[PDB]
Amino acid sequence: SMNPPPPETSNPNKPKRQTNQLQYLLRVVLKTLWKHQFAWPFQQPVDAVKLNLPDYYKIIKTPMDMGTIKKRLENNYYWNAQECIQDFNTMFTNCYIYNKPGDDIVLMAEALEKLFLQKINELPTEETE
């Protein structure tokens, strides 16, 4: 079995920006989630080879994880905060699609998504450079 290449965290041609909102995503939102006791399964791409999940990447065609998001924010990969928010949403969605509702990993993801949504209500209202 093989894993796919992970999602890119840098791209030489993609315009880069640091916005007030992107800075709040790094300094607050991701800080809270990264350090939470439920974060660790989500800190790196799903390793389908080590987990013995040969169907994972047959079912999940848009992978995403918090390690990728952290590297994207540190590399100033994004133009806007909505791209980052979309990545968190993808990560949660993937967990809910692959696993059975009420598996422990799903309940953990639900708890992190609830926390995520709480924190992103405190984003600066207007995105500015």
Ligand SMILES: *C[C@@H](O)c1ccc(Cn2cc(-c3c(C)noc3C)ccc2=O)cc1
């Ligand atoms: C929340 C905690 O109880 C727990 C449960 C299960 C695992 C096992 N596991 C699962 C994954 C995984 C992800 C992130 N998405 O689909 C799966 C199957 C990854 C690593 C891992 O050890 C960990 C913690």
